[PDB]
Amino acid sequence: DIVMTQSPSSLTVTAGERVTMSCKSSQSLFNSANQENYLTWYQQRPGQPPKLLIYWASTRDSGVPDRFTGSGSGTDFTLTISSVQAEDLAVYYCQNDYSYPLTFGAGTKLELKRADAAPTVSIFPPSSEQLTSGGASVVCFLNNFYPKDINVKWKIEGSERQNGVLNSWTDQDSKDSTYSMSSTLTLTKDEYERHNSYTCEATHKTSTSPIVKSFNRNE
């Protein structure tokens, strides 16, 4: 097993700046006969297969921008992006293509840094179709904010509710570098109709005052 060590685990950079990530192999990938390094770089966007970036340690594949540059020899290799774009958000992998078994590094996650942005908050009552399910979901969308850290509090007639709440963050947006998160409060139909006022409060570092959206069953 040739172990491939990548550093760091994650990068954070503002659009337009230069990053360099490292890949180290436990044994040399350099073929002294033809003087080539059997090292390959990949870019993997969320939910997609890896995309070949550079092979032979430094040769770019067809259609890869020149801002991607691979360097190094032997056991030390680097991948440099001279001007990181918003679209460059991905996990970057190096791969031993020298000896069996072929092995990959653990990847380096490239995240982007941008100006703070307040979230847009929307609250949605349970649908009439779900009320026949015997369940009732109250959904709150917090769209396009930065940084990623954000807090959501649910209130039922002014009283805070803790569990039954499930949150999920999107991956960073690939063009504006913002984040979005959903918060779902799930109750039974009987407990939902036991109440009237439902409130979703978003507190982000962009303001000391929470953004509060409310829904009433008798609107």
Partner: protein
């Protein structure tokens, strides 16, 4: 026009076997190696092995050699991988990848998500998210209570793609719940139709829920 088209996601029981396919079009099937790569959820990539369809030649990673068999059918230009004695650790996305005469894998399939679980296949219930009755407006669809992953959500069959956010599913009640957001010009809704297209391929279910006002 190289295309590696893999079979759909599958839910398999522990200790059973699963065959997944990779139909390779656009090139001479018998002139290139076909590699297979595993990616466990949230983890990195692991190389499984390769096959040369031109003669049936294979080579395996010792980690997978005990429970993996690679085959190829030249008449149907399709490569197969048999995973046997599956465990929960084998839940992952499996890619097929073709190499080139340089090193590395320039062509990849879309990946096949295999979930090893004893739970049953459950199609989702798709609920419209419409604003309460009391510039622009945000709508949504709630995809609640399905298993296994994944689901795909589009809006107006791909027309509304800008301003669309689909949030990663969370596992509660031994089921997955997902939501997707869409924001359109307020002058277009309810003037025009907004529809979410939810597909649950492991159940072969598709739902087209129109968002109507309350």
């Amino acid at each position: 026009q190289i295309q590696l088209q893999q079979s759909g996601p599958e839910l398999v029981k522990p200790g059973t076997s699963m065959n997944i396919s990779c139909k390779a079009s656009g090139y001479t099937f018998t002139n290139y190696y076909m590699h297979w790569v595993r990616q466990r959820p949230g983890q990195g990539l692991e190389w499984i092995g390769w096959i040369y369809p031109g003669d049936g030649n294979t080579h395996y990673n010792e980690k997978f050699k005990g429970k993996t068999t690679l085959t190829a059918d030249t008449s149907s230009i399709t490569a197969y991988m048999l995973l046997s004695s599956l465990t929960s650790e084998d839940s992952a996305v499996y890619f097929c990848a073709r190499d080139n005469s340089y090193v590395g894998f320039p062509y990849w399939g879309q990946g096949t998500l295999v979930t090893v679980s004893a739970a049953k296949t459950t199609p989702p219930s798709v609920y419209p998210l419409a604003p309460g009755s009391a510039s622009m407006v945000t709508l949504g669809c709630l995809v609640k209570g399905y298993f296994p992953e994944p689901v795909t959500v589009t809006w107006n069959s791909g027309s509304l793609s800008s301003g669309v956010h689909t949030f990663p599913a969370v596992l509660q009640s031994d089921l997955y719940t997902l939501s997707s957001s869409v924001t359109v010009p307020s002058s277009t809704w309810p003037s025009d139709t907004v529809t979410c297209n939810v597909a649950h391929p492991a159940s072969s279910t598709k739902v087209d829920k129109k968002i109507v006002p309350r």
